[PDB]
């Protein structure tokens with residue numbers, strides 16, 4: 268039953284993986300070994316090669332990601348060996364350091380031991396490893412509203428934030444067998460942040476905006492050949508609109524457009540003036556400029572879509588079906604200036620892939 | 630068989646229409662009459678009230694339209710009585726005059742005789758009643774590329790364009806029984822155009838851009854209670870991004886962004902400068918300003934989305950299911966600054982509705 272689903276997923280994954288790796292003759296024997304391993308044990312263990320290629324295929328199959336051209340250069344760190352909360356903490360710290368790479372960001376995934384019988388070995392509570400706290404109480408809003416529930420959960424466990432708009436949340440995760448997660452403050456030497464300034468409007472720094480360098484998404488499940496890696500944080504580099512059109516602009520996030528409009532010297536009074544649009548463009552210019560000036564990797568949405576076009580072409584050339592989610596692939600600014608807007612995409616789900624999972628708080 | 634489909638569509642339409650009109654008691658007798666009419670004749674004829682309410686319901690059910698708040702104020706002109714090409718031409722001329730309304734645009738639909746047995750009585754070739762010609766030959770591109778095939782078809786029939794970038798196509802339509810369509814030049818007194826200028830950048834007029842006042846879509850089919858009105862042109866007023874983000878900006882349309890960038894004084898050299906985005910915002914500001922200054926109705930995408938929010942609320946309050954196509958409802962600039970971007974919509978098709986139909990040329 269469980270063995271059944273597993274073996275089926277396994278046969279399909281190994282066949283495809285080994286084919287792509289030019290190891291097609293090795294499949295029969297590898298499947299034999301896996302078959303006996305499942306019978307005796309209830310599951311099977313991926314070789315380092317399978318796990319590496321599987322994580323890369325999962326990125327390649329992520330319909331919502333515009334950054335997939337670079338799927339084959341993912342840096343895969345195998346941490347299936349950790350057993351203690353100090354090892355997990357140090358692996359997470361290491362991921363941050365090695366992914367950051369002094370600003371020349373390396374797309375990286377660190378893979379922790381998989382669920383055994385749907386039992387998690389490690390359960391990471393963070394949405395991203397580096398993220399700002401948010402607070403709301405009696406009229407007063409501080410920080411990132413999207414972090415309010417995790418922030419409140421951390422404070423239940425004895426963490427206390429300084430209540431700036433940019434407090435770094437601690438790493439917070441739970442080990443199998445523990446009733447409660449543990450938390451660890453991030454060493455500030457590990458976390459690059461970028462102050463937001465504008466290439467020609469000097470007043471822009473009056474907003475005192477900043478953002479962190481590396482988005483390291485840490486609450487998705489990697490599924491490969493029927494094995495469920497629920498703890499497997501990964502990162503790329505940012506596309507500037509994630510920061511400038513969404514994290515800093517959304518009304519339910521930092522909500523900065525009215526403030527941007529004021530410092531760039533335009534009125535925010537009439538919809539027909541398109542002041543929100545103009546503010547969005549200047550904010551997004553500032554974000555790109557600031558990351559580039561600091562030597563931290565970032566891509567703008569035009570260049571990203573041009574890369575995605577080459578991914579579509581590479582898929583066709585490899586004879587691989589392309590899958591995509593148009594509603595996530597279009598950028599939130601000037602979407603019709605990208606080729607993505609003017610075509611359609613098949614939203615089928617192909618495995619290996621990354622998946623949402625239930626949050627352990629709220 | 631044909632009578633079958635028709636009667637079914639009829640029962641459903643009359644029931645819903647009469648319910649909305651508070652005429653629910655009248656349904657049984659009206660359906661009786663329709664039943665006998667279908668038997669004897671092969672179809673049935675809508676009352677003026679049914680046709681009016683049906684056209685309004687079709688707009689209300691148009692998933693891709695952000696302008697639906699105003700569905701109930703559609704001005705319905707019943708031209709089921711025309712029989713000659715001179716009557717059709719004059720009805721089309723009248724629609725333009727009455728919809729334009731000296732710039733205070735009235736959403737209007739003119740309804741011509743329906744298909745009888747899938748046989749069209751009138752077949753309009755224009756995509757819109759007012760639209761610019763386009764030409765391409767030996768490297769040279771003039772006018773609106775989206776009009777190249779209709780333009781070439783018109784010139785086959787002895788029309789000749791002046792080959793400016795803004796030649797008005799003639800009305801072109803075919804009457805049942807004629808092998809060929811006829812064409813008629815538009816009287817220039819009927820067609821309002823708006824020169825595009827910028828509220829603060831004086832050089833913008835050097836681009837010599839203009840657009841026409843009223844989008845009058847004339848190649849869709851209105852289907853109401855199983856009756857197929859294949860000729861039923863309608864108009865609203867423009868949302869500024871249709872002109873500024875698409876007709877004048879798309880690379881396969883007028884392709885003006887590099888030219889806009891030059892006149893607003895920014896370089897068009899680096900993607901990270903977001904010059905296309907900045908040019909798009911200034912072009913779209915200019916379009917709104919120019920229409921407002923000339924006294925021609927137009928709506929900006931923020932105000933339009935705010936109106937659409939009130940449509941969603943009115944639907945809920947009326948106990949009507951809302952349907953929508955997210956990919957067409959989001960505006961092509963700053964989509965994430967509208968509420969539309971942050972929700973999903975059910976793309977089910979409900980009738981009455983407007984439908985694509987095959988073009989009679991190409």
Ligand code: HEM
Nearest residue numbers: 326329331332333334374375501502503504505506566621
């Ligand atoms: C290298 C630079 C990368 C860029 C610039 C990039 C860009 C993006 C963007 C802009 C999104 C949409 C985010 C949103 O709208 O919330 C996204 C989604 C995604 N990316 Fe990438 N990405 C990159 C690398 C990666 C890597 C390394 C992985 C995994 C190995 C990954 C997996 C995904 C997934 C799973 C999603 C969808 C998440 C969801 O469903 O919520 N990306 N990417």
Ligand code: HEM
Nearest residue numbers: 688691693694695696736737863864865866867868928983
């Ligand atoms: C009153 C002002 C109106 C505004 C501002 C408006 C706005 C728009 C916009 C922006 C589009 C998308 C166009 C595109 O992306 O190509 C659209 C689609 C549409 N509108 Fe409206 N509209 C209005 C009135 C009307 C009226 C009066 C009707 C019919 C009675 C109508 C029927 C539709 C239909 C059928 C579509 C989709 C066409 C397709 O599938 O290609 N609209 N509308």
Ligand SMILES: CN(C)Cc1ccc(OCc2ccc3ccc(N)nc3c2)cc1
Nearest residue numbers: 482484486487502503504505506509623
């Ligand atoms: C838990 N869900 C309700 C929210 C959720 C939202 C975005 C998520 O990831 C977005 C995402 C994922 C990977 C990325 C890689 C690089 C990049 N620049 N952005 C990226 C953005 C994951 C979960």
Ligand SMILES: CN(C)Cc1ccc(OCc2ccc3ccc(N)nc3c2)cc1
Nearest residue numbers: 593607608609610611612875956957958
């Ligand atoms: C597989 N293709 C041949 C079919 C196909 C291509 C693009 C498609 O749409 C792209 C698209 C998406 C959103 C739009 C919103 C407005 C608009 N005027 N066109 C829009 C066009 C649809 C189908």
Ligand SMILES: CN(C)Cc1ccc(OCc2ccc3ccc(N)nc3c2)cc1
Nearest residue numbers: 844846848849864865866867868871985
């Ligand atoms: C024949 N199809 C391939 C293309 C096609 C594209 C847009 C069409 O209508 C778009 C449309 C329809 C009604 C409108 C009413 C008002 C407005 N501002 N734009 C509007 C825009 C109809 C057909």
Ligand SMILES: CN(C)Cc1ccc(OCc2ccc3ccc(N)nc3c2)cc1
Nearest residue numbers: 513594595596955969970971972973974
């Ligand atoms: C019926 N609702 C409760 C479910 C529902 C609401 C909004 C949904 O998505 C809106 C939406 C569309 C496109 C997006 C692109 C990127 C992004 N980060 N979020 C995006 C969010 C999806 C489901």
Ligand SMILES: [Cl-]
Nearest residue numbers: 482509510514
């Ligand atoms: Cl983010």
Ligand SMILES: [Cl-]
Nearest residue numbers: 844871872876
């Ligand atoms: Cl148009």
